[PDB]
Design a protein around this ligand. Structure first.
Ligand code: CLA
Ligand code: CLA
Ligand code: CLA
Ligand code: CLA
Ligand code: CLA
Ligand code: CLA
Ligand code: CLA
Ligand code: CLA
Ligand SMILES: CC1=CCCC(C)(C)[C@H]1/C=C/C(C)=C/C=C/C(C)=C/C=C/C=C(C)/C=C/C=C(C)/C=C/C1=C(C)CCCC1(C)C
Ligand SMILES: CC1=C(C/C=C(\C)CCC[C@H](C)CCC[C@H](C)CCCC(C)C)C(=O)c2ccccc2C1=O
Ligand code: SF4
Ligand code: SF4
Ligand code: SF4
Lengths: 742, 74, 60, 80, 74, 139, 42, 161
């Protein structure tokens, strides 16, 4: 039983004394401010626990309680989303007419004329239209009334109170010891089996007993207040066997392994529900049951307290071949002694998962009536692409912090890290060559086309009606996926997604999903995507690989993860730290994700979304102009940015005037950021000197001496206002455009 | 509309004049570099010490006022 | 001057030029800058003390 | 090469000499200050111009001053 | 008419930036404080913080309210 | 005094961070030091190497690389026995550090002061005064 | 009331947030009861 | 009137502004039933719009050709309520804030830790100061003439030049 619970009782005293002493947590800041830099240094380093404390135990305790604090905030946020749906929303009207009423759960007070923002969203209601897709979640859950939304709000508040209590308790009353946190096998067993497996199994149980009967009655056409309450399905097994006759047999088919009895409610249909344009909820129930089974099975792999199981150290040290030296030796010690190494991995994986979520949710719309709510589809795709890109860049930020701080060459001799660092020139030069090759042959095709179309030579362009660059491999994969039902997925009835090919699914005469054809424009913009991803990888990987030392600076690790430069010598070493490659790679992440969301928006409006008129013909939002206009830069400028900015700039005086104002405000913040990015600290300190002189003249100089922001902070402020302005400009443009036209 | 744009032009003029005048009058020396004249007109910086000295030369005030000249003529 | 007295600095490239410090010690050797002066403001380097002469220090 | 000068305000703290990454500076004997020593720059052909010496200096304005000059392979920090 | 106006205003902005740049080069390179004892030039440098701080005030004064009225009307 | 070319190098598996053609055609730097143990250190140019008990010898391209390694050995393994040489392709070996047997941060007799200016930094000459003149700005 | 909690409420960010929220709040109330004051009425 | 402008009460373009603003609200009101909350909300917005236009018409504001009020700020007394009097109110408040902040920085200089008084404000003393600002013109001018507002040029640190 070497896996055991061990706790220090009453470690830290619950006192308000350190609240009154800003900067108490570090030796530098705890002696008080003398320049304004102190104020900024206070906020910059506060959650950098391993910079304040030496012991891994106190660092781990601080992290565990701060994760409870984050959970308390998330539960409060969810509870507020449920309360605003319960109290300030048109949810009940939307349930009756999901295709006519526009979801709205935010109402403004009338103060300075701002009540114009309460637009006519439908259902005898006025408010701000919301695009987070909560209404479709609630209908998929089977809520059907504001009363149940009040009970969800209370459940969120109770969970929020319990998490903030748990964070206080586990830091101040009962704090686990370091040997508790260093149980990677137990943590993985419980998080696969307990968290993910029982999470999926419990949700599958809810889908089967509540979501399936309530949504079958809704899609049959029964009015929401005419539908039995969710517990009458739990008790009256006859009423449940009316909708799903397999329930007449109970749980005997489950235990006797006669599972094909349950095909009423555990299906493998594929495709979309024709009534709602969403995934069949019988499929989601079977999906979550099967995922639950193999998460509970996977959480039995690792050894904890009884001899059965794997040691992760043995698995890692055994995988070594002739190219890679000692192999994965020493990786277990890294990942059980460095929080930054774990955060680097978990942030890169969480960001990748959010990017996958963005693709899979537009293509296989999971919720009822979310596919034809176009503002929601665009909002949640764009939102989860931005969350993914940010989290991937933080994975490289914390890989650099690990390499600078937690990396020890003595414990990493001739293993995989040592070998990567010992051929980092070959890696970075080959990536550099790929990024050059791939910018020339992706963006240079666009420049070739701008030139040919401008010169009157349309026969010389890369286009469908000219020299063709067809995506044959992507087209072939689409062919296979349309042939799969009955062929390589024989028991499936429909395709996984109609994006691959097949029918047009229309709900309320709007297209839910329809085949997304790939042509020359799609070949070009996919290689634009590969180019921007490869360049972002180049900047972040070069920062991680050269974080400790270079040919330029041989002792970069002594300067730290975040330093501005090492002087103007050696020609100039500005922005040489690992932090400055995260700083430069967040610009290229912004560039990459901006092109992805523009490609999605234009392609879906041009070739997927729209209205199905009589005879089955489809009229798309922008009328199929992607094919012949996304092949030039002038096409993107004219037919996408210029044409579709009409709604933001004409929004003044309507309910969308807030988006027009945020469009302009974000243009402002973006431009304002360039003051911090193109400038240097020395100019601003010399300007502050004359301002300080004028204060001395009037005897009003402050005792906290004003300073220009640090070099790093000028870079961080420039980057924050750049991203805020650019993302904000797109946020306003996307939302006003798709609310007006979709 | 002409009143508002005239005040914007006045703001742009006075700010470009600020950057250029500050570059001319701090060219010989300042509090960060009291000996700035020994280094010339165009030098990169004085290094990361004393808090950081990027764009401390008078040339860098020409550089910074060029953006404001472009903005005002815009 | 004398130890403990308040002095106004006259070294034109001092951070504290025309500011007031207080004299900590005065050397008696052949030192070029024998007056040690401490200040309440820190310089841009975060130093709050410096050595001076007698022609660049005046009592107030 | 770069030009490195030491002015007679040096308090002989040796901090510039310890901070120099290229062994440009060293301490010589001098009666001017209390410490009995002053910094010296005998090997400026090796100076890369990092200005770590100036960062280390605690006198009000730097006793050690680096003046970036003509570039060579040594002062450019080129390992190629 | 449009091209001629735009052309000569951009030429004007370049010439004005250059005049201040070469005044900065003058102070760094060609100005001798000892042949200019208590001149108009030396007294300019003698109250350069009064000049720079009052440009700072008038630039901020113009900027806050011109942008405030524009954002007001918006 | 002279570099004994036969001193065994610390065990190392190679890297791309080592010296290039400029070392074999312009100049190379060498560092020797004594280790009481057979212990792992970090190379300035890459990964980890193992210094052998007894005398070690390395070759690097830059003087700063030899001194960054010297700083490391002194700080962690307390090895103050390091001698840094410059080597020209003619075979000439030039002893570099410590230049007179004593570290530069310790005073030594017979060191002559280079670069020392008799006044403070604010007493330099204005550029206009020495324009079209060869006279130096340091007074 | 605890003197350390009051010393926390005297910190610059708390006072700045409270004072500017109170300030914003009586601008809002004054524009609720007396709206559209483009001019001093005279 | 002044500068060829028209009083807003007799401008025809001002009247068309009021009518168009009310028709826009009435067509939104035409889609709701009488006692509903959106109907009461829009009826209260039509009352607010008419009240604003009526008040502007009777105030002596001058409208342009576009039918919007224009402000005369040359100093004439018939129009002092558009800039001169709002400006006097502002300068009284701004000078109050400046006088009170200056009094607190001078107090904080005489403290045990002067820089701790600026990140942890002594709230009773700072409230003693905020109350004093109501007579800032007299206090500040007497401060000026008694030689305590302006410090002489030789106690101010400047660049070497
Ligand atoms: C967590 C997310 C979240 C978000 C973003 C919102 C957002 C909003 N809510 Mg909702 N709400 C939420 C959760 C949320 N709510 C929850 C959980 C509940 C259940 C209790 C509610 C219940 C609720 C009601 C009942 C109402 C709103 C309303 C509003 C709106 C106006 C709020 C306002 O101006 O009051 C401002 C109120 C103040 C008292 C101002 C306080 C400002 C202080 C100074 C902030 C200072 C914080 C402090 C300094 C922190 C440090 C502590 C200190 C010790 C240092 C706005 C759209 C209103 C609305 O929509 O009307 C149509 C409304 O009536 N909310
Ligand atoms: C079955 C066991 C189990 C479960 C469910 C969890 C769940 C969680 N752990 Mg883990 N943990 C476990 C065992 C478990 N742990 C063990 C054995 C160890 C020791 C090795 C750890 C060590 C550990 C650390 C060190 C950390 C976590 C963290 C977390 C949270 C991850 C963030 C997240 O997804 O929360 C959101 C998802 C949720 C589902 C929120 C649920 C909130 C409660 C706590 C879940 C369980 C409720 C209850 C069992 C269900 C009752 C059902 C009933 C109605 C029938 C999550 C609450 C991280 C964290 O955030 O700490 C707070 C963290 O840093 N855990
Ligand atoms: C700053 C972070 C942030 C914010 C504010 C949001 C905000 C939102 N998300 Mg997103 N999300 C994020 C990060 C974020 N997301 C990340 C990092 C992921 C990747 C795991 C996702 C994946 C995700 C999914 C899959 C869904 C949302 C949805 C939503 C919306 C409804 C919120 C809700 O009730 O969830 C409700 C969420 C659900 C009902 C289903 C969630 C199912 C996932 C699989 C749960 C996984 C939990 C598990 C512990 C995570 C393991 C991660 C893995 C790598 C180990 C809202 C727009 C929902 C949406 O688009 O509705 C229209 C939705 O279905 N989010
Ligand atoms: C954690 C998830 C969860 C939870 C709490 C429940 C809970 C329940 N299920 Mg459900 N169920 C789940 C997952 C879950 N189920 C999954 C994943 C499946 C798919 C295999 C089913 C399939 C299923 C069927 C087919 C039936 C239940 C039934 C029941 C009830 C059990 C009554 C009983 O033993 O007699 C059961 C009857 C016998 C003859 C034995 C109870 C409310 C029964 C019920 O009352 O339906 C409302 C029932 O007939 N469940
Ligand atoms: C689970 C996620 C996670 C976690 C726990 C951490 C945790 C940490 N990071 Mg990492 N990081 C992450 C994600 C994460 N990061 C991501 C996604 C990125 C990519 C941007 C980074 C990039 C990054 C860098 C580049 C650095 C860190 C650093 C740090 C450490 C210091 C944090 C601190 O004191 O900041 C205090 C927090 C603040 C000052 C908050 C201000 C930040 C922005 C500007 C405000 C947010 C704007 C807001 C959302 C929108 C405003 C609305 C507007 C309209 C008004 C800490 C260990 C730093 C370090 O030194 O670590 C050793 C460091 O240098 N991180
Ligand atoms: C849109 C872009 C933009 C904007 C607004 C500014 C604005 C300014 N610049 Mg910068 N600058 C920019 C781009 C910009 N610059 C670029 C691209 C460059 C080239 C590198 C420069 C280079 C530059 C130099 C070199 C100098 C300036 C100067 C100035 C000031 C001149 C105007 C003035 O004095 O008062 C105008 C004041 C404002 C516009 C401030 C706006 C008021 C704010 C928005 C109040 C809002 C508070 C609000 C509640 C905050 C919310 C925060 C939220 C988190 C709660 C002003 C701060 C000069 C200066 O500082 O002299 C005094 C100066 O010397 N700028
Ligand atoms: C651009 C320069 C400029 C300046 C500085 C002024 C300044 C002034 N004008 Mg204006 N004015 C200007 C141009 C200017 N004007 C132009 C171009 C015209 C068009 C011809 C006018 C037309 C105009 C009229 C019609 C009137 C003024 C008045 C005034 C004075 C009233 C302010 C006050 O309270 O003082 C006087 C009051 C005190 C000193 C104490 C009061 C308590 C003030 C001195 C008014 C005035 O009284 O004239 C002297 C007035 O009736 N002005
Ligand atoms: C109450 C304190 C105070 C006082 C009396 C002054 C006085 C002055 N300032 Mg300074 N200033 C202050 C605070 C103060 N400032 C702060 C906090 C900042 C940082 C944002 C600045 C930034 C600043 C700049 C950048 C400039 C001045 C300038 C000026 C001068 C002209 C007036 C002006 O432009 O205002 C402008 C005021 C601002 C731009 C910001 C003021 C922000 C708030 C409103 C003031 C602080 C309130 C404070 C919290 C009081 C709390 C009191 C309480 C504890 C009892 C004058 C010397 C200008 C100058 O030198 O011209 C000769 C100039 O260029 N000031
Ligand atoms: C930086 C620098 C350092 C030192 C050296 C340096 C090069 C010298 C310097 C550069 C300085 C620079 C670049 C300085 C630039 C200076 C500039 C651009 C000065 C502009 C002057 C214009 C004037 C005085 C117009 C007067 C018009 C009038 C009076 C009209 C009157 C009227 C008439 C006749 C007709 C209409 C009615 C009214 C209005 C009554
Ligand atoms: C303007 C500018 C400054 C000066 C900027 C300063 C002093 C910031 C001004 C902040 C004032 C004191 C408060 C105003 C803050 C805003 C009202 C809102 C801030 C929101 C967060 C700070 C909470 C630099 O120091 C700098 C350094 C390096 C490169 C570029 C630059 C640069 O461009
Ligand atoms: S100071 Fe500014 S400019 Fe000089 S090197 Fe460091 S970063 Fe580059
Ligand atoms: S640092 Fe400045 S003071 Fe200390 S020794 Fe080197 S030069 Fe002399
Ligand atoms: S600049 Fe860098 S190298 Fe040249 S002397 Fe000063 S420290 Fe040594």
């Amino acid at each position: 039983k070497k896996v055991s619970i061990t706790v220090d009782r009453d470690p830290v005293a619950t006192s308000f004394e350190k609240w009154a002493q800003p900067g108490h947590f570090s030796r530098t800041l705890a002696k008080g401010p003398k320049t304004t830099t102190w104020i900024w240094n206070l906020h910059a380093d506060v959650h950098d626990f391993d910079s304040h404390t030496n012991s891994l135990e106190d660092i781990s305790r601080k992290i565990f309680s701060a994760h409870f604090g984050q959970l308390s905030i998330i539960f409060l946020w969810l509870s507020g989303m449920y309360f605003h749906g319960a109290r300030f929303s048109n949810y009940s009207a939307w349930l009756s007419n999901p295709t006519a009423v526009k979801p709205s759960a935010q109402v403004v007070w009338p103060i300075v004329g701002q009540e114009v923002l309460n637009g006519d969203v439908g259902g005898g209601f006025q408010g701000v239209q919301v695009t987070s897709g909560f209404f479709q979640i609630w209908r998929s859950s089977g809520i059907t009334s504001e009363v149940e939304l009040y009970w969800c709000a209370l459940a969120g508040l109770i969970m929020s109170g319990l998490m903030i209590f748990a964070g206080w308790f586990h830091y101040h009353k009962a704090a686990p010891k370091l040997e508790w946190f260093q149980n990677a096998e137990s943590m993985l067993n419980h998080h696969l089996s307990g968290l993910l497996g029982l999470g999926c199994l419990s949700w599958a149980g809810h889908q089967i007993h509540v979501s399936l009967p309530v949504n079958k009655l809704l899609d049959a056409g029964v009015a929401p207040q005419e539908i039995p309450l969710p517990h009458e399905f739990l008790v009256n097994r006859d009423l449940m066997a009316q909708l799903y006759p397999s329930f007449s047999k109970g749980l005997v088919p489950f235990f006797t392994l006669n599972w094909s009895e349950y095909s009423d409610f555990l299906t493998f249909k594929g495709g979309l529900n024709p009534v709602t344009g969403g995934l069949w909820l019988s499929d989601t129930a079977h999906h979550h049951l099967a995922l639950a089974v193999l998460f509970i099975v996977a959480g039995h792999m690792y050894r904890t307290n009884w001899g059965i199981g794997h040691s992760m150290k043995e698995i890692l040290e055994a995988h070594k071949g002739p190219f890679t030296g000692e192999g994965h030796k020493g990786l277990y010690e890294i990942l059980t002694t460095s929080w930054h190494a774990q955060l680097a991995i978990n942030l890169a994986m969480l960001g990748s998962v959010s990017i996958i979520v963005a693709h899979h949710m537009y293509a296989m719309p999971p919720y009822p009536y979310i596919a034809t709510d176009y503002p929601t589809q665009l909002s949640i795709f764009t939102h989860h692409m931005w969350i993914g890109g940010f989290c991937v860049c933080g994975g490289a930020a914390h890989a650099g912090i690990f390499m600078v701080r937690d990396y020890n060459p003595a414990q990493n001799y001739n293993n995989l890290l040592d070998r990567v660092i010992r051929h980092r020139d070959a890696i970075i030069s080959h990536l550099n060559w790929i990024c050059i090759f791939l910018g020339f042959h992706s963006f240079g095709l666009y420049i070739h086309n701008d030139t040919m179309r401008a010169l009157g030579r349309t026969q010389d362009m890369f286009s469908d009606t000219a020299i063709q660059l067809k995506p044959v491999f992507a087209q072939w994969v689409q062919s296979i996926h349309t042939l799969a039902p009955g062929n390589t997925t024989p028991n499936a009835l429909a395709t996984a997604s109609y994006a691959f090919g097949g029918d047009v699914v229309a709900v309320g005469n709007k297209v839910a999903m329809m085949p997304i054809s790939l042509g020359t424009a799609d070949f070009m913009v996919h290689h634009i995507h590969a180019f921007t991803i490869h360049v972002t990888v180049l900047i972040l990987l070069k920062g991680v690989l050269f974080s400790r030392n270079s040919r330029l600076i041989p002792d970069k690790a002594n300067l730290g993860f975040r330093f501005p430069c090492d002087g103007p010598g050696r020609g100039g070493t500005c922005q040489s730290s690992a932090w400055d490659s995260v700083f430069l790679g967040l610009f290229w992440m912004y560039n990459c994700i901006s092109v992805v969301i523009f490609h999605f928006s234009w392609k879906m409006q041009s070739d997927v979304w729209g209205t199905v008129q009589s005879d089955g013909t489809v009229t798309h939002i922008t009328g199929g102009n992607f094919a012949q206009s996304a092949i030039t830069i002038n096409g993107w400028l004219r037919d996408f940015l210029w044409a579709q900015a009409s709604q933001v700039i004409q929004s003044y005086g309507s309910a969308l005037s807030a988006y027009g104002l945020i469009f302009l405000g974000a243009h402002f913040i973006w431009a304002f950021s360039l003051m911090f990015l193109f400038s240097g600290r020395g100019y601003w300190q010399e300007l502050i000197e004359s301002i300080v002189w004028a204060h001395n003249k009037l005897n009003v100089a402050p005792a906290i001496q004003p300073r220009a922001l640090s070099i790093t902070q000028g870079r961080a402020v420039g980057l924050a206002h750049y991203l805020l302005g650019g993302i904000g400009t797109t946020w306003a443009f996307f939302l006003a455009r798709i609310i007006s036209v979709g | 509309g002409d009143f508002l744009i005239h005040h914007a032009i006045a703001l742009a003029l006075h700010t470009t004049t600020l950057i250029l005048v500050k570059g001319a009058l701090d060219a010989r020396g300042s509090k960060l570099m009291p000996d700035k004249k020994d280094f010339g007109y165009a030098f990169p910086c004085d290094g990361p010490g004393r808090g950081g000295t990027c764009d401390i030369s008078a040339w860098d005030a020409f550089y910074l006022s060029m953006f404001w000249m472009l903005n005002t003529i815009g | 001057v004398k130890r403990g007295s308040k002095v106004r600095i006259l070294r034109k490239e001092s951070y504290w030029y025309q500011d007031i410090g207080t004299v900590a010690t005065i050397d008696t050797s052949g030192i070029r800058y024998p007056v040690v002066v401490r200040f309440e403001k820190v310089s841009y380097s975060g130093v709050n003390t410096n050595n001076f002469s007698l022609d660049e220090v005046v009592e107030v | 090469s770069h030009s490195v000068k030491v002015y007679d305000t040096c308090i002989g703290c040796t901090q510039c000499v310890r901070a120099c990454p290229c062994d440009v500076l060293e301490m010589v004997s001098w009666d001017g200050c209390k410490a009995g020593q002053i910094a010296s720059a005998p090997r400026t052909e090796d100076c890369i111009g990092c200005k770590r010496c100036e960062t280390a200096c605690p006198t009000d304005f730097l006793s050690v001053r680096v003046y970036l000059g003509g570039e060579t392979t040594r002062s450019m920090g080129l390992a190629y | 008419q449009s091209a001629l106006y735009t052309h000569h205003q951009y030429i004007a902005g370049f010439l004005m930036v250059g005049a201040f740049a070469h005044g900065a080069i003058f102070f760094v390179r060609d100005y001798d404080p000892e042949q200019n004892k208590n001149n108009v030039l030396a007294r300019i440098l003698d109250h350069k913080e009064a000049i720079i701080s009052h440009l700072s005030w008038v630039s901020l004064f113009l900027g806050f309210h011109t942008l405030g009225i524009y954002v007001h009307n918006d | 005094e002279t570099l004994n070319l036969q001193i065994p190098s610390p065990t190392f598996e190679g890297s791309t961070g080592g010296w290039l053609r400029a070392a074999e055609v312009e100049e190379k730097y060498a560092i020797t030091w004594t280790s009481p143990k057979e212990q792992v250190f970090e190379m300035p140019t890459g990964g980890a190497a193992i210094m052998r008990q007894g005398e070690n010898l390395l070759y690097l391209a830059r003087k700063e690389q030899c001194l960054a390694l010297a700083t490391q050995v002194k700080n962690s393994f307390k090895i103050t026995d390091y001698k840094v040489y410059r080597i020209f392709p003619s075979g000439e070996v030039q002893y570099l550090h410590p230049k007179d047997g004593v570290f530069p941060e310790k005073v030594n007799a017979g060191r002559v002061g280079v670069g020392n200016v008799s006044h403070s930094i604010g007493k330099n000459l204005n550029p206009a005064q020495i324009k079209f003149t060869s006279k130096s700005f340091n007074g | 009331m605890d003197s350390n909690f009051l010393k926390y409420l005297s910190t610059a960010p708390v006072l700045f947030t409270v004072w500017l929220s109170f300030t914003a709040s009586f601008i809002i109330e004054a524009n609720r009861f007396f709206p559209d004051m483009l001019y001093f009425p005279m | 009137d002044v500068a060829g402008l028209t009083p807003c009460g007799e401008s025809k373009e001002f009247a068309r502004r009021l009518d168009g603003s009310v028709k826009k609200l009435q067509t939104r009101l035409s889609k709701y039933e009488a006692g509903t909350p959106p109907a009461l909300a829009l009826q209260k917005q039509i009352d607010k719009t008419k009240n604003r236009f009526d008040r502007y018409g009777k105030a002596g504001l001058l409208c342009g050709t576009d039918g919007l009020p224009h402000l005369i700020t040359d100093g004439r007394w018939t129009h002092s309520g558009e800039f001169v009097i709002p400006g006097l109110l502002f300068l009284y408040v701004a000078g109050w804030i400046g006088w009170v902040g200056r009094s607190y920085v001078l107090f904080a200089r005489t403290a045990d830790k002067p820089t701790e008084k600026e990140i942890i404000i002594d709230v009773p003393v700072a409230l003693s100061f905020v109350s004093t600002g109501f007579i800032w013109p007299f206090s500040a001018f007497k401060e000026f003439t008694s030689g305590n507002l302006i410090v002489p040029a030789d106690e101010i640190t400047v660049s070497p030049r």
